[PDB]
Symmetry: C3
Subunit: 259 residues, 3 copies
Amino acid sequence: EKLSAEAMEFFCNVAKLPFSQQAVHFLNAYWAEVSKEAEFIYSVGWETIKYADMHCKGIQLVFKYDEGNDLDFDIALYFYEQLCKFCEDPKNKNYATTYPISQPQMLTALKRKQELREKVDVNFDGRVSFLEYLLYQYKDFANPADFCTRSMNHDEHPEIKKARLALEEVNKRIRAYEEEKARLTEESKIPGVKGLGATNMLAQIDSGPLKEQLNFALISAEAAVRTASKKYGGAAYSSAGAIWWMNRDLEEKKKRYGP
Amino acid sequence: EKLSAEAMEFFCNVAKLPFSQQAVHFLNAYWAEVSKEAEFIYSVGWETIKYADMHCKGIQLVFKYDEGNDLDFDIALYFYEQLCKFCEDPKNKNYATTYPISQPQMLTALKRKQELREKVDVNFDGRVSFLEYLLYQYKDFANPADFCTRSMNHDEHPEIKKARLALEEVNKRIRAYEEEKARLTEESKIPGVKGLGATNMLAQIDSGPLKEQLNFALISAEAAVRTASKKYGSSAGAIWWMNRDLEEKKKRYGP
Amino acid sequence: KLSAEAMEFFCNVAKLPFSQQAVHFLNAYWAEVSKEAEFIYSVGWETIKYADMHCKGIQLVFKYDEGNDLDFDIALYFYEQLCKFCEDPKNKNYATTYPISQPQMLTALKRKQELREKVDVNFDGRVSFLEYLLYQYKDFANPADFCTRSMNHDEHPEIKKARLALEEVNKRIRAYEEEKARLTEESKIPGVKGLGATNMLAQIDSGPLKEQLNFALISAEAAVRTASKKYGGSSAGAIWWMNRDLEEKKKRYGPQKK
Ligand SMILES: [Ca+2]
Ligand SMILES: [Ca+2]
Ligand SMILES: [Ca+2]
């Protein structure tokens, strides 16, 4: 089913959003069908497309990465290859047995580009978005026209937007904190005077301002996620994917940078 | 056959112009040989390259498209494939039957890219312009060096330039008008007062100043095109192209 | 597989202009590769510039701002041109004098596969001169080893002075060649105006653009002598590269009459 101009414009806009927002559009639309793969989408699909994008952009450290949206076909190829390698590694056999419908398919380079071109790249821009990867991965029930029908005219609720942006503000505080850590680290290797101030600062860093600001940003995020979840996540507390993603992400953040 | 550095400089400059200018240069140069294919070039070739470019740039509506110049090999492949698809479609039989020498050829993807590397991509930039498509499609009688021979030192006449620019002024007024109609149309689906007010405004759109300015632009373009057509009708590709462009605009947006 | 610190260094080096990539690689591997330096300069670096130039729509070398890396399609052009150059009978002496610098012909498919599997070390879809070098000379060079060898080498200021002095020569070359081409074009004009352009073109070497280029050349020559006398660490690549480049500039823009 070719898309109307109106649906294509929608699709193209979603597909230029940061990957995580593409993911949430997908998850909201298909929550009834796909909720049990959410964890794979989050932990494996997202991480992998992000790493492929980082390399493309010559970024090594996650805290310096501004999240991307789509990949050219050569970079997509590295994405799908990395997916297959991850899932084929016995160290991750849990992911493979627990999420069969999420498993990628190994293909030669040639067959891969032919699938991108024939099937995955639905707006014909020579780019692969996370959205496009998702739709094709879950094609037993998902497809672009269906997706647009499901997702069009469902605007992000303001409580949800607040909570998403509060989470993005945690990212900003994490970057500020990790950049300063790394600043100090690299001065740490200045023998003398100093050189030496750097060391104590580094040693003291988690009682410093930037760590303080991160700790408080984590509380704000959490409060905002809660009020959004209470309002839209049903008991336990359409927007279900956004609710699940934000809680997952908060969880990850707290684990890594909380008390 | 291999371009001199001077011919190559020219060739590169023409391939950076918007596709439609690429088209005119090629048509002026080869009018004797190619004039009867002009409708295909305009209605199938050009339309298809513009849509390929459009998609690459994330544009769906022709009034929001700023005209491009070349495509990478992945987009080029979509372009050539869409040509084949269109021309093999029974509903387009008449383009296939009437314009046999303009028909594309089906290739696999590896065969295609290899053709783009070996034959089509004459300046080795990794891109396919409309000029490069055209030159190879009609290789029976055209080629790069002969094209540069035929095309260099034939400056666009000022009267023709003026008409071309007056036609682009129409495009600008089309865009302003369609952009307002779309904004109103959007607004129109808001529940209650606001939606109703925008539905009313849409009914008035053709009395409005945007439309007035489009009608004005159309009249000026028509004047400019007739001035140029009377004088020059070597320049035959440009005259054909601007009349064709003008006729289409008048049909869509004239009385 | 590089560490984060190494990979960052590598990516930074690979975004420098091709000639600085070259110097990085040559400074690092001078022991093992010294004898191929002329092939890297006159064949590898020329061919990669030209592929880059074409990609950017530039036809004349004096109009080109040096790049840093190529997409896979342009890399393919680069490798095919290397092979073509090396297979031309007129260039048999490059083939024979520099056998370890020799490229291998591949089909397009196989080329792109090798770019992807072997050459494109930082997985960015681009081929840098550094990447081409590391893989061509992989018998003794690899990315980790390179970073190990290079991260601890700094460009001494007298050497940077020299590099920059040579780039100043490039800017004066451009100004001169642009005026030569402008007069050349002007001398087309059939009347007495072609005659005036024709004469200015004929006299151009006694003009001030050429004078300014002569000064730049001489200043680069002092700056290069200073660097070379002090360090000729080790900065063996850099010292070789500046002198070689100076020699080239002298041959084309220095005294011409014998
Ligand atoms: Ca796409
Ligand atoms: Ca080209
Ligand atoms: Ca690379």
